[PDB]
Amino acid sequence: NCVADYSVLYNSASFSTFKCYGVSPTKLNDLCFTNVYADSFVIRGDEVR
Amino acid sequence: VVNQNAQALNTLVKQLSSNFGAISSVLNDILSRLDPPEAEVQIDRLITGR
Amino acid sequence: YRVVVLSFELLHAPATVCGPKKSTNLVKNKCVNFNFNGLTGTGVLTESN
Hints:
The structure is cut from a larger assembly and holds 3 copies of chain A. The first copy, chain A, is built from 2 helices and 1 strand. By secondary structure, chain A is an alpha+beta fold. The termini of chain A are far apart. Chain A: This is Spike protein S1. Chain A: It comes from Severe acute respiratory syndrome coronavirus 2.
């Protein structure tokens, strides 16, 4: 129950590794979803692959 | 004869609900989710089965 | 590397979270391309009983 604008993150370069397996990064705003869960954590450098 | 044609038509319509290995049967969902080059992979599966 | 994994639930419930997409007026008795809660399709919109 909010407004999710994902274009600000795509326009401004921040994330070093950004990949969407389920959907397209440009279609995140076009198609929207009900529940959004974000799991935040930190890992060693080589463990991101 | 009437029942035979009814079953053939009904069966033909029910195949549209089948995924045929694709993520989803609806074409608008594939276009609204996967990238243009990625959507072709899923669209090919639907066309193949259909 | 700070990692945040984006998870979502699709078409299992109405969409409470949607980006800043401006809504328009409704049209009836005409064939139109309608997008409602992320559902895309073309069809004539009429009042149903």
